[PDB]
Design a protein around this ligand. Sequence first.
Ligand code: NUH
Ligand code: NUH
Lengths: 113, 109
Amino acid sequence: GRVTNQLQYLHKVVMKALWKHQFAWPFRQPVDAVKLGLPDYHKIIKQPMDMGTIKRRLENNYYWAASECMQDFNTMFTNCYIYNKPTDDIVLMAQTLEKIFLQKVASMPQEEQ
Amino acid sequence: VTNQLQYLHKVVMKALWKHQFAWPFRQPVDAVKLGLPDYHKIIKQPMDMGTIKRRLENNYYWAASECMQDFNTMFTNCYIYNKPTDDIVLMAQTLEKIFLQKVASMPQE
Ligand SMILES: COc1cccc(-c2ccc(=O)n(C)c2)c1
Ligand SMILES: COc1cccc(-c2ccc(=O)n(C)c2)c1
């Protein structure tokens, strides 16, 4: 991978803000389908993603560009919306976090180093 | 007329509006036409590219983030309402990947 201004911003500004959020706790580690008793989870969601995986990826220089990291954030939120019932609280929690994500992405340093 | 909103109009909406998977998203969901009587019960804030495009043309938005939330609502409505295996979900995912790719290069300020 490599280090850019944008990947540093996604790590220190965007992820830090989302991580600490009161609705973040279900998203900080992989969904544990066994523990939650969701035997269909991995049959419906083919690309699991979580902020713990994204954080580790930013720290281990896995990403080559900001867009790749932003795609992982998007997969995490989309997985939640696709799997869960529209009425589930987790959907409202994902939407709240996703709004912060987009607000902070709009303020990201424009040209990548 | 911010730098960011011009980018969202000329780069993002330009790319998404003409995409081969855009046609289901170009106008509001017609629940009667599509036979979806539960659509307006499940989706409380309908959104579509027609509406976003109109809003960009009519200088409705005060910030880029507001236009970005409308795009996000349109995609999220699709993931929440539809079955995981429905083609429309793949089409939404494809458009949204382009949305995020282009937003990654949007100017600051
Ligand atoms: C401790 O972690 C938890 C606890 C409870 C639920 C979830 C959970 C369920 C469904 C879902 O889509 N996500 C993203 C998280 C995660
Ligand atoms: C002519 O317009 C069409 C045609 C077929 C499907 C949809 C459609 C269904 C469900 C849904 O969520 N969306 C966003 C679009 C729209």
